[PDB]
């Protein structure tokens, strides 16, 4: 179904630009469909067929885009071997998926019994296999991975029909047209790339710009302007990087960015105001998940500090209240007819997450007077603060910016309860006095009515992008029934 929809678009504008890479390469819609059809031809030539699973160990390239579409066209299913997978995690990922082959384009050590590796470029046959009339695949076409757990990530599978419907709904709500140019600086291994940029552009007849996820933010900022991008999605940390790179300099030319989307983590009022002042854009808040697709956003071209989102037209939302005291504050529960098919081989996770027709996000949202919803963070991160429930990322940003710490991680002190007690792990700035740390910390905590148990340490587990790994911090210092660790 995905190939078909792509082919219809290509037929109307065969010679229109479809994909541009930051470093020069390009393809029209007709050229891209030819590459897909030639990649289908080579995949068939290598014994791949419907139902097979194709693991991918690949950098961002037009060829990787064609491979995804070729897989979908022949009724195969692709799965990324995430770049942070080491040899052991590759073995595990292979045990869970059982792929027919690993398509590779860079040196990498695979485990001993791995499926055969095939170099990406050699899958492009010289002679294209035209898609035959009467061929359509509506079922599974991809396995994807969760993120942010200390465990091996959970496998998610999507059907083509549900994905295509979900993307068309978002594209309608969001106002995407063929005029748009999507700037994608994430690895194609993740839905942040493939959903918000690749299929968003191609199912629209728009243009996709493939950038290097490893490029420094100054480089990406020049490229966002040069390539005239109108739409992109990035994490808060990515916008903070952009801002820092541009702060104090004459503003970049981001005038074409009518859809600068941000989601995936806490986006503060200060981040949004910063982006306006430094980058001269109004960041548009979005919200979703690889499990669900896109659920909410705020496409208004205003500074969105202190403003929430609304459901994507066709998505249902309710709050499961944390307490009958505050109905406007609860776990966010979502309703859709076109989500993923859930988790592979994880019965506990599916049971807690897919409860019938409903999708339980495990995130805390709040309604505001204006009827919008602000997603505040994980339910497991709620603190009972002055002024209502407060989510730890909020306190983390406050402490980090106002106190002489190199980093901080705030967690609720006790696993099961909603308390004003915070477990506060501080990495002290060794250059600054300790009394200055505790005065500054006391101020933040008192601003929120919080009680804290403080753990000073420079032995912080970090994520690969340098943030505290709060799950590992909790497993070490969380309190028990008999007292503090």
Author numbering: 1 to 485
Q: What sentences appear in the manuscript?
A:
We determined a 1.9-Å-resolution X-ray crystal structure of CysF, which revealed a large N-terminal domain with a smaller C-terminal domain, similar to structures of the related acyl-CoA and amide-bond synthetases in the open adenylation state. In silico docking (ICM Molsoft) was performed with CysF to investigate the potential binding mode of the intermediate 2a-AMP. These results showed that CysF is responsible for β-lactonization, rather than functioning as an amide or peptide synthetase as initially proposed. Although the CysF reaction with 1a did not afford 4a, the inclusion of hydroxylamine in this assay did lead to the hydroxamic acid derivative 10 in ~50% yield. However, with 1a-AMP, the negatively charged C1-carboxylate results in additional unfavorable electrostatic interactions in the sterically hindered and strained transition state, which presumably impedes the direct cyclization to β-lactone 4a. Bioinformatics analysis of available bacterial genome sequences also revealed several BGCs similar to the cys BGC, except where CysF and CysE are produced as a single fusion protein with a linker sequence between the two. One of the fusions (BhCysFE) was overproduced in E. coli, purified and then incubated with 2a and ATP, leading to a quantitative production of 4a. CysFE may, therefore, have evolved as a bifunctional fusion protein to facilitate channeling of the more unstable β-lactone 3a between the two catalytic active sites.
Here we provide a full characterization of the pathways that nature deploys to assemble peptides with β-lactone warheads, which are potent proteasome inhibitors with promising anticancer activity. Warhead assembly involves a three-step cryptic methylation sequence, which is likely required to reduce unfavorable electrostatic interactions during the sterically demanding β-lactonization.
